[PDB]
Design a binder for this molecule. Structure first.
Ligand SMILES: *[C@@H]1O[C@H](CO)[C@@H](O)[C@H](O)[C@H]1NC(C)=O
Lengths: 49, 48
């Protein structure tokens, strides 16, 4: 927190919570393909839910 | 679907128990646009 927090808030370090399956061991997911939680298809830059 | 919500300082508290919750019908009956959850994801809410 000394070296890497920011007075305005360190937004640099990002993490993922939305994925189709659980991450497998010894693997990383840099992909940011728009994930969809809602019942209908979602597309483009964003979609509802 | 209340007739009217409370004031911000006399904020209205109500406990929900002895019942089954579905958040799918909670949104699908009535369009809305603000949503953010901590300690759980909006999908996984359905089963814990
Ligand atoms: C909310 O309740 C009223 C009756 O008090 C009903 O007419 C209305 O359809 C309900 N809301 C929705 C979104 O269905």
């Amino acid at each position: 927190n000394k070296l890497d927090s920011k007075v305005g808030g360190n937004y640099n370090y990002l993490y993922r919570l939305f994925r189709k399956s659980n991450l497998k061991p010894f693997e990383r997911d840099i992909s940011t393909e728009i994930y969809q939680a809602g019942n209908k298809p979602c597309n483009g830059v964003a979609g509802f839910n | 679907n209340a007739t009217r919500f409370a004031s911000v300082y006399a904020w209205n508290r109500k406990r929900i128990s002895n019942c089954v919750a579905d958040y799918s019908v909670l949104y699908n009956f009535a369009p809305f646009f603000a949503f953010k959850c901590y300690g759980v994801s909006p999908t996984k809410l359905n089963d814990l």
